[PDB]
Amino acid sequence: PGMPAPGLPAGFERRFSRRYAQLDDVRLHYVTGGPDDGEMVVLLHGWPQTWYTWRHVMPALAEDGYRVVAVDYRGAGESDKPLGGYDKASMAGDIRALVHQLGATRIHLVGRDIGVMVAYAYAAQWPTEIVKLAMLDVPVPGTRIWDEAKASADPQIWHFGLHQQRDIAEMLIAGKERAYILDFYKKRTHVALSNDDIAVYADAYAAPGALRAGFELYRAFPQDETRFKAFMKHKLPMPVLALAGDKSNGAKELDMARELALDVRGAVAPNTGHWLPDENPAFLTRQLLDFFRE
Amino acid sequence: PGMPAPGLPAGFERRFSRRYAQLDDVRLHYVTGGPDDGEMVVLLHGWPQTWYTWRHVMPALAEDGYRVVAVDYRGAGESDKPLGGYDKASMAGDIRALVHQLGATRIHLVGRDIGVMVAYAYAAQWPTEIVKLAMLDVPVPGTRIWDEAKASADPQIWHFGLHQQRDIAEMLIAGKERAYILDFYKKRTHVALSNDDIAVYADAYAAPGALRAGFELYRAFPQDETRFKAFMKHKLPMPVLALAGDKSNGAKELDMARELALDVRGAVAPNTGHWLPDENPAFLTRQLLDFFRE
Amino acid sequence: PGMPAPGLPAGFERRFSRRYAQLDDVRLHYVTGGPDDGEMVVLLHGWPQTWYTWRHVMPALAEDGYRVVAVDYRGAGESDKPLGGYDKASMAGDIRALVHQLGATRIHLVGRDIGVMVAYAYAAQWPTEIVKLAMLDVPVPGTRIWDEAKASADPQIWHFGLHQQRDIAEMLIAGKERAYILDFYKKRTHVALSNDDIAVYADAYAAPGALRAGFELYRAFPQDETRFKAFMKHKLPMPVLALAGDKSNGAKELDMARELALDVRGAVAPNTGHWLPDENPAFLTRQLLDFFRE
Amino acid sequence: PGMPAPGLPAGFERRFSRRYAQLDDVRLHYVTGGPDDGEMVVLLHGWPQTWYTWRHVMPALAEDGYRVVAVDYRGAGESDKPLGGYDKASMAGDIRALVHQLGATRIHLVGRDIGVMVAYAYAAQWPTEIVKLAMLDVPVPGTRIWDEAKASADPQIWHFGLHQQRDIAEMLIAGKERAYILDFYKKRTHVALSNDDIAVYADAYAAPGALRAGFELYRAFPQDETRFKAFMKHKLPMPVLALAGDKSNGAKELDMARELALDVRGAVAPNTGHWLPDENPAFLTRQLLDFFRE
Amino acid sequence: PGMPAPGLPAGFERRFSRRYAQLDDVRLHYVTGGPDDGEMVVLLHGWPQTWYTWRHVMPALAEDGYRVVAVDYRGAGESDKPLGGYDKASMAGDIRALVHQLGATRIHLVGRDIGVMVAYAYAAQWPTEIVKLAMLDVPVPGTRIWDEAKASADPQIWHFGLHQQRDIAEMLIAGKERAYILDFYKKRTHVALSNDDIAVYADAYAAPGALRAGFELYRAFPQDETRFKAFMKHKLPMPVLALAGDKSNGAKELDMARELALDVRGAVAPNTGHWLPDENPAFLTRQLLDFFRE
Amino acid sequence: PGMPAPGLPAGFERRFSRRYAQLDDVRLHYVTGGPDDGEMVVLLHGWPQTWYTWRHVMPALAEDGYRVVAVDYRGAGESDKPLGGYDKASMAGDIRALVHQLGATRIHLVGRDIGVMVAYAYAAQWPTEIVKLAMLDVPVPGTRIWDEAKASADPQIWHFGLHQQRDIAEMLIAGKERAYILDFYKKRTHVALSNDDIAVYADAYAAPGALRAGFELYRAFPQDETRFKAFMKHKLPMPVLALAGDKSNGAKELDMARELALDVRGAVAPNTGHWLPDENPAFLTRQLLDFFRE
């Protein structure tokens, strides 16, 4: 029993900090906590999200001694909104430059949606640098699960077309970010979420340039498909964990991951929709802690 | 003495949960609490309301051992907004499918306004399934009390015309839901309500499709009148309780119910307007608990 | 054959003029032409209209030697929008003050919709001053045709309720006058009209105070119903002509007038909707000229 | 020392209640507390205010055993917004009908701004019914202090012209109530107020009809001047207290009151602007308690 | 050589008329000309269009002795916007009811885009009533050309997804009809069109309910695909003409029609985009006249 | 007889030109025609106007051999909107700089409203440079007619207060220039004007800075009153003509001018309101030509 409880979990404000990393062109925002010497765990959100999606996962990771780094990737949240560089492979390079600036090289990596595309491109480009990789909720371009949704005209990716209309998508949705993003979020959730938590994301995407930069991730999709099919000719060597909720992609996340990697295990969260960190963080953290210590 | 106190009563968040039920086409949102094995009590709001109207009635019901289920019916609150199915008889079928999915068959049923129309159609269609039925605040289509308001051009149903103008009602009221619904609410209340509580409803009706779906309930009224007069040829067998406030429909709710059912008792809430759950929940819960245990 | 031709008929601008008349507490705008000494013919529009509705009738009246006076009544068009005086009997006093100010006493009088209510209250209050009375399109309060529409809850008067909600009607429709009024107009026409001509009306009602003043005509209906029923105990002595289109009120305009007057004749315009001067001015003009010279 | 503290004082919510009084046409909202048998004290706000302006005065009055009744007069706050009746003498009749419905006859009366006009008209019309009258902040129509501001074109009454423009004032200020009313308030205050408290008023005047009804008080001013000069031919018999802040009308409030009444005492609040209940409630309550018990 | 010439061709206004036809539950608007006894030719527009798209084709048809009937189908232009009936087969029933109401039985039938789907469902349901059928610009559901576009995720149907999001599409595009529709139109044209002519379409879709009604055409596509595949088991017996521009669907219009009909001929307009009646009416008119007299 | 004819008179476009003059800190826009060597006649508009108000007077002046110069003064029309210099005496310096820049020294000078204040300050500062002075419609600060209007609180200057509220006036009226200015204009006219002509003025004041610059004319009134009273100790020596309409200031324009000048003649236009050049240019033109050649 219990009504949705919005906001950061108790004690969060004391153990995490907001920080910036200046890369060559772009400044990235991220939130970090946990032991300065711990194994680094990087968490990458998707669309329409920010670092905030991980709020209920980050304390448990830090309390198990991980150095937690939750990044607003290029164009999202409080990060800069540059003109280009929104293909996932180049965005993986942004994350890597941030990791190196923090003194790390080998990391654990967790991604969902656009972030799982970024994460995969990070592992394909620098396989020796990713100790373990966890893949949540969405398939990556290049996979058959991806191609099947496209050829089916799957209802839950209806928005790819709209988002790929340069200037038209921005003109339609500017000023209506909250109504658009709340509707998007609730149609894919199964666990009841708080409007206040979803509004944290929506307000981020109403900031100047946030809509455009979010949509350019979609507009780079055909480039990602080409780049990713090339990546897929070399299966990933490191252990991979695939998770998704049963009301959304479910077992297809693990099907998808097996086309990508040699060493794969997976699970399906019960009574959970599209937003694993929002909807079922308890299941997510237990799976990650067992995976990372294994 | 006491100024209006907005929000959920103390302790509510701990004993109730928000949940979804997927029916064949439509997903319905509801809030539930109380013993899992208790006799189920279903509560149906009206226009412009959500489950939230019952917030002060639900804890007392659960504490007397009832399994409380307060539903956002088709098109309202956090439920889906489909193209059609807004005649009350079909909406009663939605509620019944939800009840069956929760493992129940025989229920106690409470409705107000549009919800009392839905509730009545539930009892007329499946009379053996409704153990007791409580009817609040508004008469149902087909009754003489209903027809008399229409032929009188009663001032408090001036909005039937406007709401029945497809697209015109939405175009006029979109963007002004809060000013429109607050004015609507306060003109029919007698006990002073908090603007914050009324704004919970208004914000629900500003969500995409909520205005249209709310208005299609009105646009189905001529169909309901025909269906309901057919229902009324067989009087209801189960005990029925009729309640309304003295500043609004008052004793006419009990007059109305006697055309519908054989076994009827009623009361009039003192110094109470149109919104019995908002205005006088203490009177309402005492009447319901005496009725349900009798 | 022929597409709708917007604007004033050829040669109108040269033969008619716009003028203002300052009365005690209202300035009225009116348009006039024809011989300065001719028998005066006064034409009264309704809602949502101005004098401009008579554009196709006025030249023929003037060319037959009548002094044509087309009035924007209190609150409409370019007339003033005072605080009160929107009961039809008091508005008929405005028209009389204007007629007297122009040097005339006996008039021929033509009204439609709200203007036919004003016209009737003019004839009832000063019967010796009305030579002949023509009644178009809409029944007047107090008649059985009026009372039946309300008790039937006739769909074509759905807007009475909305218009009687003070401040609520203005707030909903302000800024949407064109969309509101063009939809209202086209739903009641049968002859295709030009959007440019309907936009002349719509733009008049967007001017400061024009919505309020128009709606106050509706808000005075219960006062009008009481007053007119008293007028109706004395049937009018002067000749009366009743006209309406077959796609709208048709023969009921003549039924209604026979309750008001002793000397009544009528006709029904074929393939004509609610707006006789806009839709079929040729039929109207022939009827008015035959009646006036008879 | 101390930053402005917004909101109701501690303990207010427990000892006061919001209630309605239905008069013949109009429903008035008021807030009341204190002993049911105590001498009644009625408090009348001005423009742009509601009962809320008295929040810091009402507890001290109740704790000295007064039955406190703070009214939203006709058109303001949560009261109805009728078509007319905004001349102060008729508004005094509304307050008297409310007082009688509460079982009282003899009262103490406090008014400021428009409310002090209402209060004075109450005392002039029913002098035996007003035990003591306190007059704050603004002079009443008919006085020389009033006429001198008008002939001077005093800057702080620049808005009389604008407010007296029917429909133009509403069209300019609708949607900008908060910016307009905050600017109005701060330009006349001397003690720093909280924006949150001023926003309580501004939001009240953005409700449907609140702007129009507020402005009709100004539009009745020429009628009030005539009525009030007639009232002034009979000086008031009961004791009168005149108060104002030194940064605003100051000693002119007592000058003004001496043209109205025979038995007059006054004081000037130090370092206090136009809004005595908002700015210096401590000075105000001490003056009222000494006056009422004297 | 020549700049775009906006508006109706010279002499059109005199030879054609706008009319309404009241059917059971829909009033349809249409434009007609030519001899009252000529063989009837019905022209059906698509999205986002009205009858006005045929402006340059209708005079030549009438001058060759055809009775021209250009229909605004259910929900479009000046026609009514009912709640349902937007599956193409049911809309073909509207067109037939109109044809019969005009005294005709056998017709020549021309459609493009949504209108070519309606036209096909008309010929499939009542084949003996269609003398000849001309199919322009767009393939119909159920054909291989239609199925390939969806499985390819063809860029030029990106909007199907958005248009199928009920309430979301309306909320995003309301108030932006002109910018949305002019961009949509120009991206698919090859001949330069006048903004004034495209604005005729855009303004029609800004009218109350026009966005909803248009999008409901898209929302019925899965129902249409099922129905049309059943129609396609019986190839049409009457002669069929297929036309499309070379910069858009080109020869695929004839490929598609040979899957639907036994007797098919076609041509491809040179240097012509998606909008044959707007871009190259001279080519279209010659093709239609040669086909009709053959 | 005749309906309002909007626009420039026939043949105007060919005989007059728009030009700019760069002065030290302001660029002024003006319209000129007539013989390059003729005696110069300068025409100065008021609020809310531009040079366009003289459209019907300028051709007759030019055809009589005058060099016509109609100026948009500092801040108005197409002139610059600098930060200051809106006291009339300094603005008269702008006009003189322009006259000298055009090669002239002695001028005939015509002003109405704000332009008649500028014109008077021009004649008072450089009396030998003004051959004859014509004063229209409005009294100037410092005169008894001006002082009486303020002390009477004359209704027709209600807007002085609003216009003097810096930033508040701009915020309220921005975006509502057309509705604000058309209402202002029509309340002071007696001859019916075309909305299209008043909209020329209204659109000029919607341009960036035009509201501020116009209101700064009002905000300088107390500076103007002081300066003009000093000018008035020396009555003007050159011949003066005073004109105004009988429905507005009438004979008071001549009363006012006799306080300013020794050699004064005047006339009152019959059935003419506040806007002499718009309402009765024929009367104005005859008066100006007889005066100039006398």
PDB file of N, CA and C in Angstrom, chain B residues 48-77:
ATOM      1  N   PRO B  48     -17.622  17.923 -12.464  1.00  0.00           N
ATOM      2  CA  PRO B  48     -16.257  17.698 -12.950  1.00  0.00           C
ATOM      3  C   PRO B  48     -15.357  17.140 -11.846  1.00  0.00           C
ATOM      4  N   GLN B  49     -15.353  15.820 -11.631  1.00  0.00           N
ATOM      5  CA  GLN B  49     -14.675  15.219 -10.494  1.00  0.00           C
ATOM      6  C   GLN B  49     -13.778  14.071 -10.939  1.00  0.00           C
ATOM      7  N   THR B  50     -13.047  13.536  -9.954  1.00  0.00           N
ATOM      8  CA  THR B  50     -12.234  12.334 -10.032  1.00  0.00           C
ATOM      9  C   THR B  50     -12.484  11.519  -8.765  1.00  0.00           C
ATOM     10  N   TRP B  51     -11.737  10.412  -8.609  1.00  0.00           N
ATOM     11  CA  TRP B  51     -11.821   9.624  -7.373  1.00  0.00           C
ATOM     12  C   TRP B  51     -11.642  10.493  -6.135  1.00  0.00           C
ATOM     13  N   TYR B  52     -10.875  11.579  -6.269  1.00  0.00           N
ATOM     14  CA  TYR B  52     -10.483  12.430  -5.153  1.00  0.00           C
ATOM     15  C   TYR B  52     -11.671  12.975  -4.379  1.00  0.00           C
ATOM     16  N   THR B  53     -12.854  13.041  -4.993  1.00  0.00           N
ATOM     17  CA  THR B  53     -13.992  13.584  -4.261  1.00  0.00           C
ATOM     18  C   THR B  53     -14.337  12.770  -3.022  1.00  0.00           C
ATOM     19  N   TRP B  54     -13.937  11.501  -2.978  1.00  0.00           N
ATOM     20  CA  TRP B  54     -14.261  10.585  -1.890  1.00  0.00           C
ATOM     21  C   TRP B  54     -13.191  10.537  -0.798  1.00  0.00           C
ATOM     22  N   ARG B  55     -12.165  11.389  -0.874  1.00  0.00           N
ATOM     23  CA  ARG B  55     -11.005  11.297   0.011  1.00  0.00           C
ATOM     24  C   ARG B  55     -11.374  11.234   1.498  1.00  0.00           C
ATOM     25  N   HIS B  56     -12.436  11.930   1.924  1.00  0.00           N
ATOM     26  CA  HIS B  56     -12.815  11.934   3.336  1.00  0.00           C
ATOM     27  C   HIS B  56     -13.789  10.821   3.696  1.00  0.00           C
ATOM     28  N   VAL B  57     -14.215  10.014   2.731  1.00  0.00           N
ATOM     29  CA  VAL B  57     -15.158   8.942   3.004  1.00  0.00           C
ATOM     30  C   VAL B  57     -14.405   7.620   3.003  1.00  0.00           C
ATOM     31  N   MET B  58     -13.373   7.529   2.161  1.00  0.00           N
ATOM     32  CA  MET B  58     -12.684   6.256   1.980  1.00  0.00           C
ATOM     33  C   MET B  58     -12.016   5.713   3.245  1.00  0.00           C
ATOM     34  N   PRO B  59     -11.319   6.514   4.080  1.00  0.00           N
ATOM     35  CA  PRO B  59     -10.698   5.930   5.286  1.00  0.00           C
ATOM     36  C   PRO B  59     -11.695   5.329   6.250  1.00  0.00           C
ATOM     37  N   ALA B  60     -12.811   6.015   6.522  1.00  0.00           N
ATOM     38  CA  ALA B  60     -13.815   5.465   7.428  1.00  0.00           C
ATOM     39  C   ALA B  60     -14.387   4.154   6.894  1.00  0.00           C
ATOM     40  N   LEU B  61     -14.587   4.052   5.580  1.00  0.00           N
ATOM     41  CA  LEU B  61     -15.069   2.794   5.027  1.00  0.00           C
ATOM     42  C   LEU B  61     -14.045   1.681   5.243  1.00  0.00           C
ATOM     43  N   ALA B  62     -12.763   1.968   5.007  1.00  0.00           N
ATOM     44  CA  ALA B  62     -11.742   0.940   5.166  1.00  0.00           C
ATOM     45  C   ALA B  62     -11.596   0.537   6.624  1.00  0.00           C
ATOM     46  N   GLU B  63     -11.740   1.498   7.528  1.00  0.00           N
ATOM     47  CA  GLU B  63     -11.588   1.211   8.941  1.00  0.00           C
ATOM     48  C   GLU B  63     -12.756   0.403   9.487  1.00  0.00           C
ATOM     49  N   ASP B  64     -13.891   0.375   8.786  1.00  0.00           N
ATOM     50  CA  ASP B  64     -14.988  -0.515   9.140  1.00  0.00           C
ATOM     51  C   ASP B  64     -14.905  -1.843   8.418  1.00  0.00           C
ATOM     52  N   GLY B  65     -13.772  -2.120   7.780  1.00  0.00           N
ATOM     53  CA  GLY B  65     -13.493  -3.377   7.126  1.00  0.00           C
ATOM     54  C   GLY B  65     -13.970  -3.533   5.708  1.00  0.00           C
ATOM     55  N   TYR B  66     -14.314  -2.443   5.020  1.00  0.00           N
ATOM     56  CA  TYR B  66     -14.679  -2.527   3.617  1.00  0.00           C
ATOM     57  C   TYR B  66     -13.432  -2.418   2.752  1.00  0.00           C
ATOM     58  N   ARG B  67     -13.427  -3.161   1.642  1.00  0.00           N
ATOM     59  CA  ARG B  67     -12.432  -3.007   0.583  1.00  0.00           C
ATOM     60  C   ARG B  67     -12.887  -1.870  -0.329  1.00  0.00           C
ATOM     61  N   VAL B  68     -12.222  -0.729  -0.246  1.00  0.00           N
ATOM     62  CA  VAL B  68     -12.680   0.482  -0.919  1.00  0.00           C
ATOM     63  C   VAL B  68     -12.048   0.573  -2.293  1.00  0.00           C
ATOM     64  N   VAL B  69     -12.878   0.797  -3.309  1.00  0.00           N
ATOM     65  CA  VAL B  69     -12.419   0.956  -4.690  1.00  0.00           C
ATOM     66  C   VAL B  69     -13.085   2.215  -5.269  1.00  0.00           C
ATOM     67  N   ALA B  70     -12.316   3.290  -5.392  1.00  0.00           N
ATOM     68  CA  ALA B  70     -12.789   4.564  -5.942  1.00  0.00           C
ATOM     69  C   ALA B  70     -12.222   4.721  -7.360  1.00  0.00           C
ATOM     70  N   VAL B  71     -13.099   4.705  -8.365  1.00  0.00           N
ATOM     71  CA  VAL B  71     -12.683   4.567  -9.767  1.00  0.00           C
ATOM     72  C   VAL B  71     -12.777   5.917 -10.456  1.00  0.00           C
ATOM     73  N   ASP B  72     -11.769   6.245 -11.264  1.00  0.00           N
ATOM     74  CA  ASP B  72     -11.917   7.247 -12.324  1.00  0.00           C
ATOM     75  C   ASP B  72     -12.602   6.565 -13.501  1.00  0.00           C
ATOM     76  N   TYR B  73     -13.879   6.866 -13.748  1.00  0.00           N
ATOM     77  CA  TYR B  73     -14.553   6.144 -14.835  1.00  0.00           C
ATOM     78  C   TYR B  73     -14.001   6.575 -16.201  1.00  0.00           C
ATOM     79  N   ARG B  74     -14.428   5.867 -17.254  1.00  0.00           N
ATOM     80  CA  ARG B  74     -13.983   6.107 -18.630  1.00  0.00           C
ATOM     81  C   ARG B  74     -13.900   7.590 -18.967  1.00  0.00           C
ATOM     82  N   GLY B  75     -12.696   8.057 -19.313  1.00  0.00           N
ATOM     83  CA  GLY B  75     -12.494   9.429 -19.748  1.00  0.00           C
ATOM     84  C   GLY B  75     -12.112  10.421 -18.663  1.00  0.00           C
ATOM     85  N   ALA B  76     -12.229  10.058 -17.384  1.00  0.00           N
ATOM     86  CA  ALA B  76     -11.998  10.990 -16.287  1.00  0.00           C
ATOM     87  C   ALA B  76     -10.681  10.702 -15.572  1.00  0.00           C
ATOM     88  N   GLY B  77     -10.139  11.745 -14.952  1.00  0.00           N
ATOM     89  CA  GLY B  77      -8.970  11.563 -14.105  1.00  0.00           C
ATOM     90  C   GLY B  77      -7.812  10.981 -14.888  1.00  0.00           C
TER      91      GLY B  77
END
